[PDB]
Design an enzyme around this catalytic site. Structure first.
Site, mmCIF file in Angstrom:
data_model
loop_
_atom_site.group_PDB
_atom_site.id
_atom_site.type_symbol
_atom_site.label_atom_id
_atom_site.label_comp_id
_atom_site.label_asym_id
_atom_site.label_seq_id
_atom_site.Cartn_x
_atom_site.Cartn_y
_atom_site.Cartn_z
ATOM 1 N N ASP A 1 35.654 42.290 44.401
ATOM 2 C CA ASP A 1 36.060 42.981 42.991
ATOM 3 C C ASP A 1 35.285 44.061 42.543
ATOM 4 O OD1 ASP A 1 37.836 41.420 40.574
ATOM 5 O OD2 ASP A 1 36.414 42.787 39.747
ATOM 6 N N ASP B 1 33.258 38.542 40.306
ATOM 7 C CA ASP B 1 32.627 38.492 38.983
ATOM 8 C C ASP B 1 33.039 37.156 38.366
ATOM 9 O OD1 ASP B 1 35.012 39.677 38.542
ATOM 10 O OD2 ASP B 1 34.513 39.984 36.810
ATOM 11 N N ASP C 1 39.752 36.254 39.421
ATOM 12 C CA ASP C 1 39.748 36.297 40.879
ATOM 13 C C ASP C 1 39.622 34.782 41.363
ATOM 14 O OD1 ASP C 1 37.380 36.788 39.276
ATOM 15 O OD2 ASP C 1 36.686 38.475 40.905
HETATM 16 F F1 BEF Z 1 37.278 45.242 38.999
HETATM 17 BE BE1 BEF Z 1 37.445 43.489 38.812
HETATM 18 F F2 BEF Z 1 39.033 42.950 39.117
HETATM 19 F F3 BEF Z 1 36.975 43.195 37.169
HETATM 20 MG MG LIG Z 2 35.805 41.849 37.444
#
Ligand code: BEF
Ligand SMILES: [Mg+2]
Ligand SMILES: *[C@@H]1O[C@H](CO)[C@@H](O[C@@H]2O[C@H](CO)[C@@H](O)[C@H](O)[C@H]2NC(C)=O)[C@H](O)[C@H]1NC(C)=O
EC number: 7.6.2.-
Length: 1055
Positions: free
Chosen positions: A433, A760, A764
């Site tokens: 991410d 994060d 996800d």
């Molecule tokens: F760039 Be992550 F999907 F917040």
């Molecule tokens: Mg993210």
């Protein structure tokens, strides 16, 4: 294409098959079942769909014949006349009895007219509510939590526990009490651990996916604040909270405007403007439009009503039907974890069962030739089956992972599911991410441009290196700050700007008095004459600012570049303002503009301070520009280069803009400066012309691809042949929906790539479960679903879990090799004794089984991971030439020494044979038992030391002192046993040997086999792979990602 069938039978017939398996509880069924599909098909008694209390659904993929098997309960509920509801795969397939027809939750999905949604501004008291609630089901995510009986049944239905239980019975029957108690205890506590973990996992998820928010409704009679929680119906209309309202149900907004935090969907802290559905006659659902829809789980920061009395929405999706429900359905019903080692370990245990069954035939004949009692023949033949398939084998491999779990905890990585550490070892691709993983979860001011001249000036790098003047004051007084306990509160970007300056925030209308840092190289601590707000339409805030200078005050303003320049006078505005604006926006950095109008207004007077907003925001000078952006992290750039050197591929799966994702990816090192990025965009399909995959080269000072979420969608739906070519070459996937991210990981692992994900959290989670190795960088939400958790908020975890995983997979190979070798050496000894009417005595079996094997198995598992990551990766194949040739040749030497010992013993002139008439147990002391035991005792010690290779993935063997000390003490006890007349020879029932010569010759055979064993591992390690290269140097892998890579190297994809 789904195969749906109805079910009924005679109650006695169902009871009859319950007598066959329900009394059994299934544990014998699987002991007699390879796989249940054949049994499952017609176990259940068939009928029409109506009669069916349970419906078998067999879903077929026509192309691949993917006939997946399911059986689903029939729900019967009375609306006022009973309607048939089927809860298939989570989602509600609704059966109308009148038309004999199954229908999905897309009941009205077609014909959700934009105007029709607009018309439903009020919802009927009962006559619509009750029927809608009955048809569509309740507005809550109801995950059922499985009971300890149901869990125990399915855990105990694993075949190895059944073999261990059979093993426990035969041990109890043949009086082998001590070791059986250890096997039983280890088994029982593992089951207890497994059940506790599985319950706890479900309990937290059920707790986590639940919301009890009391909310208002828009029934024309009924508008009662906090009327209900879960009682929301898909058709209903709702009134929103004015500020700080979490959305329970996915709903189109009928009137008003809203500012909402889409953290769930985009992984952004910034707000998104939401506008009313624009009146239209076509089939204009909010789904496709995607600007007039409040998606579930999101926070409404701010709600504003102007054209009507209050803000108004109509519900669209409820319960499992909403996108969040899609994510909950995604984390539930998980795809089975498929690994080469795990299947091959089961296949090697199958081969041992064939060898054992063959062994039993030899045992049965030789015992009958030996003329033993009938009862003895069944016990000793079955005993040998338990020797060939080692019942402690699963417990052994767990010890490898158990150590790594503890090592990871000390480094700070927390791991549920310890077995998954091994999957880490085989990772070829890792997904990452962007916002919160690789890019710091926050915007920081890159700099400001002065605009000293009419044309724009060169940029100032550091705001802390401030120049005093109108720009200094403009930063100070352009603020939307609230009051907390010596603490700032409001817009985080504005909060950051006040910290960037170094200023401190503490007349009849004066608020939030503005002071310098109190360092000196004229600081002039400033006040605010008036403040005028940041309206969404306005895109700007004007703050009139009075300095203690005896001068008339001026209005200082902050806003968007378009609006600020548009409102500014063109003589004052620079010629290339738009071009500079375009440069920063296209580069992906945020563009915010600062401007000012001098005010003929008196100081301290409320009347004079009060004005028309548009009068104050009239004709302005452009003061300058401000640029803020995400700064990667300290440790991101290093790790990604090491991952590149290791040749473990790095993929950026993000919910953000494409242009932003590119600049972070270039800085990060996902794409190097020499490497070439290609933007791939494909339009929606048309009747006139097909969807066009427009590939665009992106210039810049291993050619790889960049996608958007829509483009990825168009490739999977309309170009299925090309999707493989895109997945094996694509490095940056932008604007990806929470479901689409899991579908990327699913399609990646379809191509035979092993896949990891770093997250994060909250966008996800779907992937973190779906991936082979999931590492959450959040302590919140993601942790619940993710296999692994970190406290450091860094990519730094990925190197550690890779290293530990590689070590644990190498350790797991060695522990299997040892346990397989241990199995076969005991099989060789026990066969050789059985022919002579003898057997390794009890307490001679115990010594081997407990004090030798369990010590060496639990001390060879201690070795830590290697300090440097390397390009070479551990083998995945337990059924391979390298392992099987190692086992075979080591076993030939093992057999050779043991037979060599026997025939040498027979030759010596003092030698005397046994009774050969009375039973194997009854002849307690014998030379054959003594020489077989003595030689075999060392061979278990020797094999454990040789099989542990160590260096390339683990710490050097000479570092692991306790294993060498344990080996040395056990070597001293065993050499002591043979050389000394034994105080312990009495317990083990051995015969002391007078001839020092023969004893030294028997040591001679042992020391030979140590050198032989240690050499042969080195010989096969240094020769056998090289010898294979001679035999075939062009052995291309069956792994589909490798084939596609080879194909791309021959014929490159659109150059
Ligand atoms: F760039 Be992550 F999907 F917040
Ligand atoms: Mg993210
Ligand atoms: C093996 O052991 C058996 C049992 O001790 C021996 O047979 C016994 O011999 C004695 C004579 O000393 C008799 O009193 C017993 O009646 C015998 N018992 C049985 C059950 O037959 C046997 O001789 C031993 N084998 C050898 C080769 O010496």
């Amino acid at each position: 294409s789904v195969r749906l069938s109805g079910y009924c039978g005679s109650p006695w017939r169902v009871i009859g098959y319950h007598v066959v398996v329900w009394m059994m509880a299934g544990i014998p069924l699987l002991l007699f079942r390879w796989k249940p599909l054949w049994g499952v098909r017609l176990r259940l008694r068939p009928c029409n769909l109506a009669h069916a209390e349970t419906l078998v659904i067999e879903i077929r993929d026509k192309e691949d014949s993917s006939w997946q098997l399911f059986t689903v309960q029939v729900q019967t509920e009375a609306i006022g006349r009973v309607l048939r509801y089927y809860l298939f795969q989570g989602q509600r397939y609704i059966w109308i009895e009148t038309q004999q027809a199954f229908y999905q939750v897309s009941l009205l999905d077609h014909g959700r007219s934009c105007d029709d949604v607009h018309r439903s501004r009020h919802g009927l008291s009962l006559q619509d509510q009750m029927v809608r609630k009955a048809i569509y089901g309740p507005n809550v995510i109801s995950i059922p939590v499985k009971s300890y009986p149901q869990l125990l049944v399915d855990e105990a239905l694993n075949p190895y526990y059944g073999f261990q239980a059979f093993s426990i019975a035969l041990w109890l029957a043949d009086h082998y009490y001590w070791y059986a108690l250890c096997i039983f205890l280890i088994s029982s506590i593992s089951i207890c651990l497994s059940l506790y973990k599985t319950r706890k996992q479900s309990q937290t998820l059920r707790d986590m996916v639940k919301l009890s928010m009391r909310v208002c409704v828009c029934r024309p009679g009924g508008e009662e604040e906090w009327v209900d929680s879960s009682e929301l119906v898909p058709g209903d209309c709702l009134v929103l909270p004015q500020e700080g309202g979490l959305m329970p149900c996915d709903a189109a907004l009928v009137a008003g405007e809203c500012m909402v935090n889409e953290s769930s969907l985009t992984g952004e802290s910034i707000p998104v403007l939401k506008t009313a559905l624009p009146e239209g006659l076509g089939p204009y659902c909010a789904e496709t439009h995607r600007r007039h829809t409040l998606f579930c789980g999101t926070l409404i920061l701010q709600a504003r009503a102007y054209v009507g009395p209050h803000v108004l929405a109509v519900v669209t999706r409820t319960g499992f039907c909403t996108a969040k429900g899609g994510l909950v359905s995604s984390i539930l019903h998980p795809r089975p974890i498929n690994f080469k080692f795990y299947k091959h370990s089961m296949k090697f245990v199958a081969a041992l069962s064939v060898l054992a069954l063959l062994g039993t035939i030899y045992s049965i004949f030789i015992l009958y030739r030996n003329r033993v009692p009938l009862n003895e023949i069944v016990i000793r033949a079955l005993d040998l089956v338990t020797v060939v398939v080692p019942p402690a084998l699963p417990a052994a491999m767990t010890v490898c992972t158990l150590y790594a779990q503890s090592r990871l905890r000390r480094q700070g990585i927390f791991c549920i599911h310890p077995l998954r550490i091994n999957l880490g070892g085989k990772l070829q691709l890792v997904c990452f991410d962007k916002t919160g993983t690789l890019t710091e979860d926050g915007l920081d001011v890159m700099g400001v441009v002065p605009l000293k001249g009419q044309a724009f000036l060169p940029l100032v790098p550091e705001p802390r290196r401030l120049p005093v003047g109108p720009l200094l004051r403009a930063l100070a007084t352009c603020h939307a700050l609230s009051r907390l306990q010596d603490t700032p509160v409001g817009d985080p970007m504005d909060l950051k700007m006040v910290e960037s300056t170094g200023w401190v925030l503490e007349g009849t209308q004066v608020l939030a008095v503005m002071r310098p840092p109190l360092w000196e190289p004229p600081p002039v601590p400033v006040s605010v004459l008036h403040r005028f707000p940041f309206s969404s339409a306005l895109q700007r805030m004007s703050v009139v600012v009075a300095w203690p200078g005896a001068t008339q005050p001026e209005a200082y303003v902050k806003g968007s570049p378009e609006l600020v320049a548009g409102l500014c006078n063109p003589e004052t505005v620079p010629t290339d303002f738009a071009q500079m604006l375009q440069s920063y926006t296209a580069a992906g950095y945020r563009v915010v503009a600062l401007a000012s109008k001098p005010l003929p207004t008196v100081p301290s007077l409320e009347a004079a301070q009060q004005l028309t907003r548009d009068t104050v925001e009239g004709d302005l000078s452009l003061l300058g520009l401000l640029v803020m952006r995400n700064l990667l992290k300290p440790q991101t750039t290093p790790v990604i280069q090491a991952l590149r050197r290791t040749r473990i591929r790095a993929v950026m799966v993000t919910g953000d803009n494409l242009q932003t994702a590119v600049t972070v990816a270039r800085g990060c090192g996902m794409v190097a400066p020499q490497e070439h990025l290609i933007i791939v965009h494909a339009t929606h399909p048309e009747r006139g012309q097909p969807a066009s995959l427009e590939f665009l080269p992106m210039e810049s000072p291993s050619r790889h691809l960049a996608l958007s979420g829509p483009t990825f969608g168009i490739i999977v739906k309309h170009f299925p042949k090309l999707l493989p070519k895109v997945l094996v070459q694509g490095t940056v996937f932008a604007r990806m929906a929470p479901e689409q991210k899991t579908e990327l990981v699913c399609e990646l692992q379809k191509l035979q790539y092993c896949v990891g994900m770093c997250g994060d959290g909250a966008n996800d989670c779907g992937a973190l479960k779906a991936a082979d190795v999931g590492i959450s960088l959040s302590q919140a939400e993601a942790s619940v679903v993710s296999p692994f958790t970190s406290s450091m908020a860094s990519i730094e975890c990925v190197p550690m879990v890779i290293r530990e995983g590689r070590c644990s997979l190498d350790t797991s190979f060695s522990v299997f090799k040892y346990m397989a070798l241990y199995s076969l050496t005991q099989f060789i000894s026990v066969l050789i004794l059985y022919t002579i009417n003898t057997n390794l005595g009890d307490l001679q079996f115990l010594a081997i089984d407990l004090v030798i094997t369990t010590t060496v198995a639990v001390l060879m598992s201690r070795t830590g991971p290697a300090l440097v990551l390397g390009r070479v990766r551990p083998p995945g194949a337990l059924l391979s030439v390298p392992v099987l040739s190692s086992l075979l040749l080591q076993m030939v030497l093992v057999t050779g020494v043991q037979l060599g010992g026997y025939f040498l013993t027979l030759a010596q002139p003092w030698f005397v044979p046994l009774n050969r008439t009375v039973a194997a147990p009854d002849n307690l002391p014998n030379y054959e038992n003594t020489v077989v035991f003595s030689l075999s005792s060392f061979q278990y010690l020797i094999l454990a030391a040789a099989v542990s290779k160590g260096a390339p993935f683990r710490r050097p063997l000479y570092t692991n002192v306790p294993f060498l000390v344990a080996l040395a003490l056990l070597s001293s006890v065993l050499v002591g046993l043979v050389l000394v007349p034994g105080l312990l020879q009495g317990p083990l029932a051995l015969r002391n040997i007078t001839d020092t010569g023969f004893k030294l010759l028997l040591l001679g055979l042992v020391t030979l086999n140590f050198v032989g064993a240690f050499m042969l591992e080195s010989v096969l390690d240094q020769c056998l792979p090289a010898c294979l290269r001679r035999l075939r140097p062009k052995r291309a892998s069956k792994k589909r990602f490798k084939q596609l890579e080879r194909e791309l190297a021959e014929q490159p994809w659109p150059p």
